[PDB]
Amino acid sequence: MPHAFKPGDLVFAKMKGYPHWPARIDDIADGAVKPPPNKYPIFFFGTHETAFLGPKDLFPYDKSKDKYGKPNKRKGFNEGLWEIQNNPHASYS
Protein backbone atom coordinates (compact mmCIF):
# COMPACT_ATOMS: atom_id res chain seq x y z
CA MET A 1 0.00 0.00 0.00
CA PRO A 2 1.04 3.68 -0.58
CA HIS A 3 2.89 5.73 2.00
CA ALA A 4 2.88 9.49 2.21
CA PHE A 5 5.14 11.36 -0.20
CA LYS A 6 8.79 11.54 0.90
CA PRO A 7 11.92 13.27 -0.53
CA GLY A 8 13.26 11.37 -3.54
CA ASP A 9 9.86 10.21 -4.78
CA LEU A 10 9.41 10.64 -8.56
CA VAL A 11 6.16 12.15 -9.90
CA PHE A 12 4.47 14.03 -12.65
CA ALA A 13 3.47 17.32 -11.03
CA LYS A 14 0.53 19.40 -12.31
CA MET A 15 0.58 23.22 -12.45
CA LYS A 16 -2.26 25.30 -13.92
CA GLY A 17 -1.61 25.95 -17.60
CA TYR A 18 1.15 23.37 -17.86
CA PRO A 19 1.15 19.67 -18.85
CA HIS A 20 1.79 17.10 -16.10
CA TRP A 21 5.52 17.60 -15.66
CA PRO A 22 8.33 15.16 -14.67
CA ALA A 23 9.46 16.09 -11.18
CA ARG A 24 10.67 14.89 -7.77
CA ILE A 25 9.91 15.59 -4.15
CA ASP A 26 12.97 17.50 -3.01
CA ASP A 27 14.64 17.60 0.36
CA ILE A 28 14.88 20.94 2.15
CA ALA A 29 18.56 21.78 2.85
CA ASP A 30 19.62 23.02 6.26
CA GLY A 31 18.97 26.77 6.48
CA ALA A 32 16.84 26.76 3.32
CA VAL A 33 13.31 28.14 2.98
CA LYS A 34 10.64 25.60 4.03
CA PRO A 35 7.35 25.03 2.17
CA PRO A 36 3.95 26.06 3.58
CA PRO A 37 2.07 23.45 5.71
CA ASN A 38 0.64 20.53 3.73
CA LYS A 39 2.89 21.44 0.76
CA TYR A 40 5.97 19.68 -0.61
CA PRO A 41 8.97 21.22 -2.47
CA ILE A 42 8.72 19.96 -6.02
CA PHE A 43 11.72 20.13 -8.26
CA PHE A 44 10.76 20.13 -11.91
CA PHE A 45 13.15 18.28 -14.17
CA GLY A 46 14.36 20.06 -17.31
CA THR A 47 13.40 23.57 -16.12
CA HIS A 48 15.08 22.89 -12.74
CA GLU A 49 12.47 25.14 -11.10
CA THR A 50 10.90 24.60 -7.66
CA ALA A 51 7.26 25.13 -6.70
CA PHE A 52 5.25 24.08 -3.65
CA LEU A 53 2.42 21.65 -4.31
CA GLY A 54 0.11 19.42 -2.41
CA PRO A 55 -0.72 15.75 -3.14
CA LYS A 56 -3.72 16.60 -5.33
CA ASP A 57 -1.26 17.75 -8.04
CA LEU A 58 1.25 14.87 -7.55
CA PHE A 59 1.00 11.70 -9.69
CA PRO A 60 3.45 8.85 -8.86
CA TYR A 61 5.77 8.42 -11.86
CA ASP A 62 5.63 4.63 -12.26
CA LYS A 63 1.82 4.54 -12.42
CA SER A 64 1.56 7.66 -14.66
CA LYS A 65 4.43 7.47 -17.14
CA ASP A 66 2.50 5.61 -19.84
CA LYS A 67 0.07 8.55 -19.94
CA TYR A 68 2.26 11.57 -19.21
CA GLY A 69 5.76 10.49 -20.28
CA LYS A 70 5.63 11.59 -23.94
CA PRO A 71 7.47 14.50 -25.62
CA ASN A 72 5.99 17.98 -25.36
CA LYS A 73 6.80 21.22 -27.16
CA ARG A 74 7.14 23.14 -23.89
CA LYS A 75 10.55 24.56 -22.88
CA GLY A 76 12.55 22.08 -20.83
CA PHE A 77 10.06 19.22 -20.98
CA ASN A 78 12.00 16.68 -23.09
CA GLU A 79 15.23 17.38 -21.11
CA GLY A 80 13.04 16.70 -18.09
CA LEU A 81 11.92 13.34 -19.47
CA TRP A 82 15.59 12.39 -19.90
CA GLU A 83 16.41 13.43 -16.36
CA ILE A 84 13.64 11.57 -14.61
CA GLN A 85 14.41 8.35 -16.55
CA ASN A 86 18.25 8.50 -16.53
CA ASN A 87 19.44 10.40 -13.43
CA PRO A 88 16.46 11.44 -11.29
CA HIS A 89 18.47 11.75 -8.05
CA ALA A 90 21.40 13.85 -9.30
CA SER A 91 22.34 17.38 -8.32
CA TYR A 92 20.99 19.80 -10.95
CA SER A 93 22.10 22.95 -9.08
Side-chain angles (χ1 to χ4, degrees), residues 1-15 17-69 71-72 74 76-93:
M1 285 289 180
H3 292 69
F5 285 112
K6 59 185 189 294
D9 287 343
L10 306 180
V11 298
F12 294 86
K14 184 72 169 65
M15 299 284 280
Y18 286 87
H20 294 83
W21 201 284
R24 68 181 183 200
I25 310 293
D26 250 6
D27 285 285
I28 301 150
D30 284 340
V33 168
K34 299 176 286 186
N38 301 286
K39 307 298 173 76
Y40 293 88
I42 304 306
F43 177 78
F44 286 90
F45 288 118
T47 67
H48 316 137
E49 297 173 10
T50 294
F52 299 122
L53 293 180
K56 74 179 183 77
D57 288 321
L58 301 177
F59 291 80
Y61 174 76
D62 249 294
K63 184 174 210 297
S64 303
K65 61 182 197 286
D66 283 349
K67 185 171 183 184
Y68 294 136
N72 194 271
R74 294 279 249 287
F77 195 97
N78 299 336
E79 183 166 9
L81 294 179
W82 179 93
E83 295 175 354
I84 191 160
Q85 179 166 35
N86 295 298
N87 205 344
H89 302 301
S91 172
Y92 287 100
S93 294

